[PDB]
Amino acid sequence: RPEGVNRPNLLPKGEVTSVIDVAGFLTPSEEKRIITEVSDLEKDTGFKLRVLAQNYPETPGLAIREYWGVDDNTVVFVADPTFGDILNFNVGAGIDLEVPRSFWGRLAGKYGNKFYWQENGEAASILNAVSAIDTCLREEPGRFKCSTVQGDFG
Ligand SMILES: [Ca+2]
């Protein structure tokens, strides 16, 4: 409970990037793979997935608002083992309209439970969750949209 953490100092230095890995969970090559996926998704759908890997309270926190221009089309994925579900999804109102709410909890259960996180490591959890979000958001509308999660079969 620190007034809401707001640390511009923990933002990356140069040009905006859609991955802030404060915690050191991802290699540069893993970061690059997420950046590619996230760019493509945004190009194809207009949805903005942004990834913040952190250990609270070492977070840019409220600083990410201006940084990423957080809006109705933004899902902020916080991966942080200090808080609750480890995999935390902050879902813009525009995404919320297209995705069943149960999806985020199912995604968190699958790739975010503490056994999966410890066994497979932080990178694998994050990468697998990014891909499942990408897949979900790209689905055509329908009564069974995102009722299953990527990897369920494949
Ligand atoms: Ca890193």
Write out the two tokens for 85: 């579900």
Measured torsion, CA atoms of residues 58, 7, 28, 54, in degrees rounded to the nearest 10: 30
Give first-to-last CA distance, the chain, whole Å. Answer: 41
Q: How far is the CA of 1 from the centre of ligand 1 (A)?
A: 27
Bond into 57 cis (ω within 30): yes
CA of 78 from ligand 1 middle (Å) equals 14
Structure tokens at 14: 């140069």
Residue ranges of domains in the chain, CATH in brackets: 8-137 (3.10.310.50)
Centroid of ligand 1 to alpha carbon of 11 (angstroms): 13
Experimental determination technique = X-ray
- How far does residue 36's CA lie from ligand 1's centre (Å)? 15
Distance CA 135, CA 24 (A): 25
Q: In angstroms, rounded to a whole number, what is the distance separating the alpha carbons of residues 67 and 60? A: 10
The three state secondary structure string of the chain is: CCCCCECHHHCCCCCCCCEEECCCCCCHHHHHHHHHHHHHHHHHHCCEEEEEECECCECCECCHHHHHCCCCCEEEEEECCCCCCCEEEEECHHHHCCCCCHHHHHHHHHHHCHHHHHHHHHHHHHHHHHHHHHHHHCCCCCCCCCCCCCCCCC
User: Quick count: other Cβ atoms within 10 Å of Cβ 66?
Assistant: 10
